[PDB]
Amino acid sequence: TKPLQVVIAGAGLAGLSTAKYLADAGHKPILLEARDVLGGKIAAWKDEDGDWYETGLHIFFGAYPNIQNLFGELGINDRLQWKEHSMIFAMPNKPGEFSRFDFPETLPAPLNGIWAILRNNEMLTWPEKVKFALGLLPAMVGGQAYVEAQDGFTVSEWMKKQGVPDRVNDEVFIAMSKALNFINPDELSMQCILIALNRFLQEKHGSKMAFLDGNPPERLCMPIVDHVRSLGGEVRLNSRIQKIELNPDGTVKHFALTDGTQITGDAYVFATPVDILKLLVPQEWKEISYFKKLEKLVGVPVINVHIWFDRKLKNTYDHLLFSRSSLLSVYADMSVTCKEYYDPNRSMLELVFAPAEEWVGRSDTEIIEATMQELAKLFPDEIAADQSKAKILKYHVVKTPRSVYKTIPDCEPCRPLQRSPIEGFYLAGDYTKQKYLASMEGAVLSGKLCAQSVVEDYKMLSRRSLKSLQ
Amino acid sequence: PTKPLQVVIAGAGLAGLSTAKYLADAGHKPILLEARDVLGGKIAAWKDEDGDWYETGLHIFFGAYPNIQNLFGELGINDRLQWKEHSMIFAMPNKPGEFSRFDFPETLPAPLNGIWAILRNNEMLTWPEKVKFALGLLPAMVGGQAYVEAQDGFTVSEWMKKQGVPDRVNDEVFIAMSKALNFINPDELSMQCILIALNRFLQEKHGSKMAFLDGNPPERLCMPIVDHVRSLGGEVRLNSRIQKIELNPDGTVKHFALTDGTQITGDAYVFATPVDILKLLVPQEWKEISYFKKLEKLVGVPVINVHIWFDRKLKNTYDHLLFSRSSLLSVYADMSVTCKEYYDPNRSMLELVFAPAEEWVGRSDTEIIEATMQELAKLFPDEIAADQSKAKILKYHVVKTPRSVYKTIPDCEPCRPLQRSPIEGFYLAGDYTKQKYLASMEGAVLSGKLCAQSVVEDYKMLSRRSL
């Protein structure tokens, strides 16, 4: 009858998704972004030479249903560059050598996965393969209630209990743990790995990977902004929320911006990271279970390194690679994998530096030195730390000391639903209660779930608007 | 019933309590007479001067106890069973302080969870031993009721050798299981006993899952049954020991004469006492009837239940039952961890079953505690020392039952009596009577249900005999 004016704080994938689905429902979203860039943890920047550098190396999976829906709804499915159904891992014992898990396109799930492990002979011994299959069979047969019960254990703890060899946890699962939450298996919750392993057994192409064809603010965030604006929604940059001002009853009066501007609406959404929300929670809310539980959810440090080399590397892949390094996580030659970043004579390597706890405080030259020392192990005939072989033209080190929430055991009960106990106040973000981890899929789903909760409360939110008018 | 039957029951153990419960449900008037000043019998417990409880035994409730589950549900006390993890934790005699376990996945059904548990465990069985064990047992588990009854002629040690189960498996795994079920070694125990126990692992998914009662059995389990019986018109009387079964000239029961001479009469009479006590009270004129003469084979087995309260809270303990795999001890548990009412955060109490107890029921309490402390020094080598160098004993309680459950030696099954006796108006209840769930709490409760069922089936004949 009358469209709701919903004020959303933060234009990350959660905020952009909340705005997109509220606009589809016929409401008026007001999306306020603190920075001069869209995307949040997917944001990228163009330097003086016209080259892009990102907050992180982002991989889209087949088992990302809400992301697939969003891309389809915006008609940008062709912007995802799907790579070969393989998992390429480096050999730390054999420098320059790589091993891989190839998933046959003729075998369905989980047979393609079982085959990939059976076919590979350099990453697991036959006894190790048997113990691994024994240890995981009860887990894959298990339901949702089973995976939730595993949130009390670390990956290293659960692997030992299920009899999975300690070498399998160190060879295969160190790589998977750092890939999903930038921490080692001795700290990561087993529930995280089980949701990731569910990609391999549910859908056939669930574990298949894709790269975005260019920078995320232009190629993904702009299509969402254009869609929101075309339906009457507002998207404003450099609009940081300074304070959540409250009415005497405890509900939200307005969102006070950094320039003093007070923004009002029928509903209010905080699509900001959990760390920023925790600092902005009003004193009168601080003892409510919903907001007090959030103390367990703390952002994990991560570093995204970009290195442009003078030559085009002769030994590279049109894929993501698991470095199996103690300092690095996943990496990719963006001059090969990304369409907009394609260069035939100059190759660029975008690498995730994790765990980053002891590195976010160190200098960019210190980080580049450590990265070059690790690259000399992956490319021993092409890259040398003293730049004897390939030479660095330029670099970009993007540090996020508080990125996704550290998915340590027992975080799941602390994760809040999109509907808050404060009437008119809602939450969005990868950290909120949703089944697809602290991911791009999690962010988009939390947005869809937030917009859904707002439209479900339309009757109560419209009546509250006119009661205050009296 | 047109006119409710007055049924006199001798013994308020789980069999007597169950007989009284189901007779009251049928609309009859049970008169439950207990010899002692405590309810439960072999599940009875006592509160000492310091207010701490000590039990007749360490009792474990299993998922494969259908009549116990029904009773708890009927009384609405299901929450009084503290279900533990689906695991079987065993001690390592070769490696003191170390423990091995069989974990049953909650995602796999029965017997796959069991097969997985054995496959996953690598320190209690070698791969060849696992194969020989699986081969030896597969025909048995596939077997019907007629097959398990045919195995009653063999000892556990005899049958394991015949089926090709390695002698090390019988000594490693089955010594622990034999002492757990009947407080005797596999060279004496009937194979039928082990097969009924192994049926817990393949029938229901949680059949082998274990539970502890949340407190002392007389208050937490026996009182709810007594309250239920009394609310429906039934009578429960303590310190009422039956001295004699007085007979009419035709051979039937005239009355039950108590210790103080009091004569108690009814339309039907039930003996829910242990087989040893019944055998002594059988009238001379019944003694040569096959039904009562067969009972000579069924003799109570000695058992000792040790309780030790220590000054410290043990750092290395479990919220579970443990198989000591000791030559003197059987199963044990830290009751300060497993039992709700017995919970203590700074003081840990260990309740241990001392079996075989034949050479120990005669020995002093200090002699038994010394032997227990010597065995505990092997299970807790960095926490408990026999000379009390490490953890110190605050107090102890040694409960001896020289004639507990019947010794389930081979060929006892044909001697086990049905609940309906050849004497008109006289019935039997108890774990020893003919029922398929062994000499257990489940057996006791089922025998009670079967006894009450036989009494109500004979209502027409029992009501006419009254007039």
Ligand SMILES: Cc1cc2nc3c(=O)[nH]c(=O)nc-3n(C[C@H](O)[C@H](O)[C@H](O)COP(=O)(O)OP(=O)(O)OC[C@H]3O[C@@H](n4cnc5c(N)ncnc54)[C@H](O)[C@@H]3O)c2cc1C
């Ligand atoms: C190195 C790296 C690699 C990653 N790789 C992957 C991958 O391979 N696959 C995958 O699925 N995910 C990956 N992710 C995770 C993914 O980026 C996040 O899960 C997701 O983008 C977070 O979405 P969000 O919208 O909830 O939060 P954010 O994107 O962080 O959005 C919050 C927004 O709120 C804004 N904001 C903050 N404070 C205020 C304020 N006071 N007022 C207004 N606005 C404010 C911020 O500027 C930001 O734009 C990776 C992340 C990193 C950092």
Ligand SMILES: Cc1cc2nc3c(=O)[nH]c(=O)nc-3n(C[C@H](O)[C@H](O)[C@H](O)COP(=O)(O)OP(=O)(O)OC[C@H]3O[C@@H](n4cnc5c(N)ncnc54)[C@H](O)[C@@H]3O)c2cc1C
């Ligand atoms: C150490 C120990 C550990 C055990 N562990 C387990 C376990 O883990 N799981 C399990 O299922 N079972 C276990 N049991 C077995 C279980 O306790 C018995 O199977 C069951 O309680 C016996 O039930 P019942 O009613 O037939 O006999 P009882 O419980 O012995 O009852 C007979 C009653 O008759 C009374 N009585 C005797 N003479 C007279 C008389 N003349 N007049 C009147 N009353 C009389 C007695 O005082 C007693 O109360 C254990 C037993 C012991 C001792």
Ligand SMILES: CNc1cnn(-c2cccc(C(F)(F)F)c2)c(=O)c1Cl
């Ligand atoms: C920050 N979250 C991330 C980050 N990376 N990946 C990821 C990327 C590449 C490979 C893999 C893996 F194959 F290991 F699951 C995960 C995620 O799936 C999630 Cl949920």
Ligand SMILES: CNc1cnn(-c2cccc(C(F)(F)F)c2)c(=O)c1Cl
């Ligand atoms: C005196 N009867 C008993 C005594 N103990 N247990 C028992 C308790 C714990 C563990 C096990 C076992 F797992 F071995 F079967 C049996 C019984 O099942 C019966 Cl029937």
